[PDB]
């Protein structure tokens, strides 16, 4: 249904909207935003520039992995922009 992008992340910083403002992209934990999120160039292109990493709304802050994910190096997988396996709209 939903899956991470997991492509090679580049220099594009991932954003978060006002509703999804304080969660880790992976585990939804609100505690200790530790490491900044990078996203691949394709997911950050055109209309998707500055969009949210979780839900895809207008981003108002920066996305962070939690401390637990940084300890487990979950920040060092592919870029974590959630994609629905449905249409491209």
């Amino acid at each position: 249904d939903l899956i991470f992008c997991r492509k090679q992340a580049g220099v594009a910083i991932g954003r978060l909207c006002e509703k999804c403002d304080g969660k880790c992209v992976i585990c939804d934990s609100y505690v200790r935003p530790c490491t900044l999120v990078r996203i691949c160039d394709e997911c950050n292109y055109g209309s998707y520039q500055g969009r949210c990493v979780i839900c895809g709304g207008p981003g108002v802050s920066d996305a962070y992995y939690c401390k637990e994910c940084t300890i487990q190096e979950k920040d060092r997988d592919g870029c974590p922009k959630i994609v629905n396996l449905g249409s491209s709209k």
Binding site: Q8, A9, V11, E73, R76
Partner: peptide, 12 residues
């Protein structure tokens, strides 16, 4: 040594 750049691609 001033760290100019640092990019994260893999595990430790």
């Amino acid at each position: 040594f001033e760290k100019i750049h640092q990019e994260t691609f893999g595990k430790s």
